[model samples]
Target: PVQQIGGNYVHLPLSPRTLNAWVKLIEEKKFGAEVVPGFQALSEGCTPYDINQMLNCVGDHQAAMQIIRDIINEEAADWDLQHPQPAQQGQLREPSGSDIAGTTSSVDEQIQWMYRQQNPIPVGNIYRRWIQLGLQKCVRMY
Candidate 1:
């Protein structure tokens, strides 16, 4: 289990090792000597900027991935507009514009496992947007 982080990094930023490196640089607190184990789930409203400022911080060993990434279902209207039929069938069209990176490498298994386990709900629009933003942050990091 070499969670050493930068295997084939195209860029660094919050790459696993980078985060771990930054965090390890911190000394434990004085009051109760507190410590964080590692980067955990990012909650709602968390943004790429938020992560970047904090020095901050996916899927499958299966077949790659897809999905539009935004127009997050902030309301019933957005959900209806974005997903009416696609839940029953994805690939209504090919990746275009922002969707261009949809087909890359096989996803990380634990990542995929968490996603499948979460069985994320439709309120997940912001969730996906968070994902999109994270990806872009790495490319744009330096």
Candidate 2:
């Protein structure tokens, strides 16, 4: 049910039925407030497996839709500040995390760093998954 949008596969206009199911999934899994933006970011790609488990609690699809809508709406304002269309590639903005250590490191280096971070318990799949989810949220916010 995913469609191509701006070179990315996205699940657009989530159905009411699917929204209700996502609500149940978020509640049972207790992903809390973090779920709102993370779920929205998935619209760009990635399958629906862990996403449904990691979303914030919602009463129904309506609520879920509203939350994601609100996020996009909020971000819309910043879009006007600098709309980076393809034609403006020469003036593209830099990645936000450029200040971080080894921000340009290969994926393997990032994995090793996560493994060493105690807060993320870099010992298993969950840590990497959680880190990816967190980064998604960060991107949404930025």
The runs of at least 3 residues in candidate 1 whose Cα sits more than 4 Å from the true structure, single-residue gaps closed, are: 1-13, 16-25, 28-32, 36-107, 117-142
Compute the lDDT for candidate 1. Answer: 0.30
lDDT of 1 by residue, 1-142 (tens): 1122444312122446644553453323211122122222432222222333333222221111122133222232343455443332431331122221222212232222223333522222233354444434333323
* Tens-digit per-residue lDDT, 4-41, candidate 2: 56864343444566555556545664455555454454
Candidate 1 global TM-score: 0.19
**What CA RMSD would candidate 2 show?**
13.8
For model 1, what is the error of residue 105's alpha carbon versus the real structure, in angstroms, after optimal superposition? 16
Error of 1 at 7 (Å): 25
Which candidate comes out best when scored by lDDT? Answer: 2
Which 10-residue span in candidate 1 carries the lowest summed lDDT? Answer: 56-65
> Which residue pairs of candidate 1 clash?
59-107, 59-108, 60-107
Positional deviation of residue 113's Cα in model 1 after best superposition, in angstroms: 0.6
